[PDB]
Amino acid sequence: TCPFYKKIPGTGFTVDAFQYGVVEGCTAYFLTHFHSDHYAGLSKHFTFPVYCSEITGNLLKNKLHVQEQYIHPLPLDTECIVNGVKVVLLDANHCPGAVMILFYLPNGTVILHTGDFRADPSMERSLLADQKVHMLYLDTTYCSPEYTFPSQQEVIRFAINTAFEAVTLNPHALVVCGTYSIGKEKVFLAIADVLGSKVGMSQEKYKTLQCLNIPEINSLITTDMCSSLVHLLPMMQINFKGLQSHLKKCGGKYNQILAFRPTGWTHSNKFTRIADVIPQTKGNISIYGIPYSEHSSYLEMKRFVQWLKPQKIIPTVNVGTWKSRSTMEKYFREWKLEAGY
């Protein structure tokens, strides 16, 4: 049954609740972003209003074939009225089109639902600064102190330098980047840009990227693999068997693969600096695991919450075990006592 943490009290609204069939008494279904655990259940047969960002609206229309009369895209940073309730969509710093949602209840409660987000100090100068939030529905993906990772900027620097160096030493090396969903486009686009190549990918993937309102995308991507030395493949195929295979397919245009697997977190983060990352190598194939996160680290999350000072926190991630739940509630209490709210 629809869980309580996907329901907005005092409204007929749900958030990311498309896999439960008809949710009793739901008058508007909000979608934070186009990732499968969140959209699961949408299709061309959905006949209720869906509210979302313009980019997420493009992906519903073109990838899932949701009919246009049920898609209600909203501009960001703009006060809008949905079924008589004032709402604002804010940038979530997650994947393209990902939003957080501010609900202004008739009775005067203000509710922020983060969707998936990577908290950042820039959010402290959005519309959020202008009024108090009583309840926070928080993306708690990495809510434990062991989760540290570098800035996105430091990680992209690492990848750019690595790739530029390898291909300048060997102009017959191919770079491969793994993907299984939107997000993390900066990885493969930054590399292609430093090498003066377009990124080659399947037609299905090129279609997905054309939905995202990225400036000058026609200049950076292509479905012609031959003319490209940065290839995007499914994340599944980023392993020695999968890469040896792909290399055979290129017909001796290339003699070496350098591949990137942008993962969330890995236990090498507790020990290893970004400067200190090494690949796994077999033969003429090297694989780099890089910690490019589109979720908040524990410290980023803690700062955002201590800044916002909500009266109640509702976790949306890692809620399935008692030990998880109970550990998160302990951190919330530490944060609150340390900051004085």
Buried b / exposed e over 199-226, threshold 16 CB at 10 Å, is bbbeeebbebbebbeeeeeeebbbeebe
Q: Which CB sits closer to Ni ion, 93 or 286?
A: 93
What minimum distance in Å lies between the beta carbon of 194 and Ni ion? 27
Contact between 184 and Ni ion by CB under 5 A: the answer reads no
Stretch that binds Ni ion, among 30-38, 138-146, 168-176, 221-229 (CB under 5 A): 30-38
What minimum distance in Å lies between the beta carbon of 180 and Ni ion? 11
Backbone angles phi, psi at 126, to 5 degrees: -85, -170
Stretch that binds Ni ion, among 85-93, 109-117, 153-161, 221-229 (CB under 5 A): 109-117
Contact between 35 and Ni ion by CB under 5 A: the answer reads yes
Of the candidates 79, 88, 91, 87, which has an alpha carbon nearest to the alpha carbon of residue 116? 91
In angstroms, rounded to a whole number, what is the distance separating the alpha carbons of residues 288 and 266?
12
What minimum distance in Å lies between the beta carbon of 143 and Ni ion? 15
Q: Where are the alpha helices (DSSP H) in 81-195?
A: 152-169, 185-195
Stretch that binds Ni ion, among 32-40, 205-213, 246-254, 330-338 (CB under 5 A): 32-40
Q: Which CB sits closer to Ni ion, 87 or 182?
A: 182
What minimum distance in Å lies between the beta carbon of 224 and Ni ion? 30
Pairing outcome for strands 7-8 and 13-15: antiparallel
Of the candidates 289, 257, 264, which has an alpha carbon nearest to the alpha carbon of residue 276? 289
Which are the contacts of 261, defined by CB distance < 8 A and separation ≥ 6? Answer: 178, 235, 238, 287, 288, 289, 290
Contact between 185 and Ni ion by CB under 5 A: the answer reads no
Among 116, 139, 185, 300, binds Ni ion (CB under 5 A): 116
Q: Which CB sits closer to Ni ion, 35 or 184?
A: 35
Q: Which residues bind Ni ion (CB under 5 A)?
A: 35, 116
